[PDB]
Paper text:
To gain insights into the catalytic process of this non-canonical ubiquitination, we purified the [name]-catalyzed non-canonical ubiquitination product [name]–Ub conjugate to homogeneity, and cocrystallized it with MavCC74A. Then we solved the crystal structure of the MavCC74A/[name]–Ub complex at a resolution of 2.39 Å. While the overall structures of the three proteins remain largely unchanged compared with the [name]/[name]/Ub complex, an isopeptide bond was clearly formed between the ε-amino group of UBE2NK92 and UbQ40 in the MavCC74A/[name]–Ub complex. Structural alignment with the [name]/[name]/Ub complex reveals a marked movement of K92/K94 loop region in the MavCC74A/[name]–Ub structure, which forms a short helix in known structures of free [name], to our knowledge. The extension of the K92/K94 loop towards the deamidated form of UbQ40 allows the reaction to be accomplished by [name]. Structural alignment also showed that M317 of [name] undergoes an obvious movement during the catalysis, which might play a key role in releasing the K92/K94 loop towards the active site. Whereas [name] expressed in the ∆[name] mutant induced [name] ubiquitination in infected cells, expression of MavCM317A in strain ∆[name] did not cause [name] modification in cells despite the mutant protein was properly expressed and translocated into host cells. Thus, [name] binding by [name] probably promotes the disorganization of the K92/K94 loop of [name]; the formation of the isopeptide bond with Ub completes the conformational changes of this loop. Superimposition between the structures of [name]–Ub conjugate in our study and the canonically activated form of [name] bound to Ub indicated that this unique ubiquitination at K92 of [name] causes a steric clash to restrain Ub loading through its G76 to the active site C87 of [name], thus explaining the inhibition of E2 activity of [name] by this modification. During the co-crystallization of [name] and [name]–Ub conjugate, interestingly, we found that wildtype [name], but not the C74A mutant, can actually cleave the [name]–Ub conjugate back to [name] and Ub.
Author numbering:
A (entry chain G): 1 to 151
B (entry chain C): -1 to 73
C (entry chain B): 3 to 381
């Protein structure tokens, strides 16, 4: 709470008070601009029953600039690269302070239910998603059970 | 101090712009809009293999007299 | 004039059928030229170990040069070129845009019962969201972050998208008061309209609020409009005023081509709104201030087919004002049909095939061959 504009303090408290369903997001003790995030694999998606760990970080320029987010758990998704980064891409526009931490988290969650392999970040993964969606989904189920079912 | 650069597309069509070395990349995109009727939000510019970012400036990429930019129309 | 409408709809049906089946080939560009230029732009992405020539193939496999443009502006240029001919398009380009009036009426009154082409350009109001205190000694317009408010000890200025400094008309007394009230380190360089800032809380927070009110009032007379989207509407002549349809044609950056728009029949689906229903949605897009209705209408009018309800949610909610602008011109069906028929013969001649998919693939392999050879000869 120390050293922060009222907006970050209140975004934080309202995330803790009324968390996004399926998402746990709590700030680190030593650093309040850093959030330890856990997103559950949506139901009826290849990631169901998984529990994916992510890092969400508010740089010094937040909220003028978007949060940085990274997956920590490996995941087989056409929009997550080998290093855990996601496409928070706003078409025909840029990040704006009208967007919030909650919006970023809801978008990642939605993206797990709606993979988009036509505008990709993980190419190998996206190729197989467009070409062989059934095999891509099976592999993701296997990745989920190997990497995301005990932390 | 005005100067002149070229913008080329995949079809080989080339246009000529008059610009200043301090001109922002969004000013360049608006000059492309003036010539071609293409919105800035529907343009990507490439110089020397790298993308020209909004909010930066022509000199920040060291773009000078008679440089050829590449206008990408599929992303 | 019973059966009179179908010579415009044949123009519509021909361009739709050809774009659907031929994609980028309707521009009439020979496959060789496409491959040659893609080659020159591609040289630097090559891996130069092993036999570079086998990874040249890796580059040619990597090519997307036959996939159609998804620039909304470029697709509009192509629709204009096909339907009006190169010279007609050039005359249409010279006429001025009209700002769509609040109720759309100026556009409805610009659609007499002839075959018409509408071009639309839509702007988004790109006003500053950020400010920073700065000393005059430290402020350099060329290098400073653009589209930003700068509060100096004796001046309040707006550094616009073109790096020009616009004074905001405040006395040095007012600026000195505002500068000296905003003292907290993390409010020296911040955002303008924070919903959590309370003018009744603090002298600093009242100064931040007052500066936002000043900037907001001044931006109302400053041109912050930047073109964001472009499309066309074909409006064939009809047999009765109440049975007239329009057909919107668009591509959309990083989202879809005009081929894909046509394949999902969004032109037909939107056509079912009628002229008044479509105009009314288009007119509301610009008058509403409810970001949820703006996003919902934007989604309905401009998403790729089937994404109307997800297109402008979440990260892509439409927070900024939009303004629709239009221009209208008459289309000669003989000219547009002759244009389309010349392109069809060009394609049939130079890229023969039993079906359209084979002509497309022959075109693609010809372009790949020309790219392969050019990249070979320069490495």
């Amino acid at each position: 709470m120390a050293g922060l504009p009222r907006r970050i303090i209140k975004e934080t408290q309202r995330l803790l008070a009324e968390p996004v369903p399926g998402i746990k997001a709590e700030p680190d003790e030593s650093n309040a601009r850093y959030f330890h995030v856990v997103i559950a694999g949506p139901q009826d998606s290849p990631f169901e029953g998984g529990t994916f760990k992510l890092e969400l970080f508010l740089p010094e320029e937040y909220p003028m600039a978007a949060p940085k987010v990274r997956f920590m758990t490996k995941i087989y998704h056409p929009n997550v690269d080998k290093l855990g980064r996601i496409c928070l891409d706003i078409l025909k526009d840029k990040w704006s302070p009208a967007l919030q931490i909650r919006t970023v988290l809801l978008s990642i969650q939605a993206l797990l239910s709606a993979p988009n392999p036509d505008d990709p970040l993980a190419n190998d993964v996206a190729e197989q998603w467009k070409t062989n969606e059934a095999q891509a989904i099976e592999t993701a189920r296997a990745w989920t059970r190997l990497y995301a079912m005990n932390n | 101090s005005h100067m002149q650069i070229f913008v080329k597309t995949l079809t080989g069509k080339t246009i000529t712009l008059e610009v200043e070395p301090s001109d922002t990349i969004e000013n360049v995109k608006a000059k492309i809009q003036d010539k071609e009727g293409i919105p800035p939000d529907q343009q990507r510019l490439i110089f020397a293999g790298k993308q020209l970012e909004d909010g930066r400036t022509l000199s920040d990429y060291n773009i000078q007299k008679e440089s050829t930019l590449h206008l990408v129309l599929r992303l | 004039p019973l059966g009179s409408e179908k010579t415009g709809l044949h123009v519509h049906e021909k361009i739709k059928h050809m774009v659907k089946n031929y994609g980028t080939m309707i521009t009439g560009i020979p496959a060789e030229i496409l491959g040659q230029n893609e080659a020159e732009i591609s040289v630097g992405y090559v891996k130069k170990m092993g036999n570079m020539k086998e990874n040249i193939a890796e580059v040619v496999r990597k090519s997307e040069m036959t996939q159609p443009t998804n620039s909304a502006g470029k697709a509009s240029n192509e629709v204009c070129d096909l339907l009006l001919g190169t010279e007609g398009a050039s005359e249409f380009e010279k006429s001025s845009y009209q700002v769509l009036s609040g109720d759309g009426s100026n556009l409805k009154g610009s659609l007499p019962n002839k075959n018409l082409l509408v071009r639309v350009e839509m702007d988004r109001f790109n006003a500053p969201q950020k400010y920073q205190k700065i000393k005059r000694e430290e402020f350099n317009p060329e290098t400073a972050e653009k589209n930003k408010i700068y509060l100096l000890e004796d001046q309040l200025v707006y550094l616009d998208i073109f790096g020009k400094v616009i004074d905001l008309g405040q006395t040095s007394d007012t600026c000195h008061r505002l500068f000296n009230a905003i003292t907290t380190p993390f409010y020296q360089n911040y955002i303008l309209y924070d919903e959590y800032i309370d003018p009744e809380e603090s002298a600093e927070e009242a100064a931040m609020f007052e500066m936002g009110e000043i900037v907001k009032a001044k931006m109302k007379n400053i041109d912050c409009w930047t073109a964001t989207h472009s499309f066309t509407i074909f409006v064939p002549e009809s047999d009765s005023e109440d049975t007239r349809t329009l057909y919107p044609y668009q591509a959309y950056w990083t989202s879809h081509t005009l081929q894909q728009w046509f394949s999902g029949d969004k032109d037909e689906k939107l056509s079912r709104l009628g002229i008044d229903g479509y105009i009314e949605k288009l007119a509301l897009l610009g008058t509403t201030t409810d970001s949820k209705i703006r996003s919902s209408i934007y989604g309905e009018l401009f998403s790729p087919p089937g994404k109307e309800h997800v297109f402008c949610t979440g990260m892509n909610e439409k927070f900024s004002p939009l303004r629709v602008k239009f221009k209208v011109t008459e289309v000669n069906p003989e000219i547009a049909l002759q244009n389309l028929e010349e392109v069809q013969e060009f394609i049939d001649t130079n890229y023969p095939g039993e079906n359209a998919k084979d002509q497309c693939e022959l075109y693609k392999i010809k372009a790949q061959e020309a790219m392969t050879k050019q990249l070979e000869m320069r490495l």
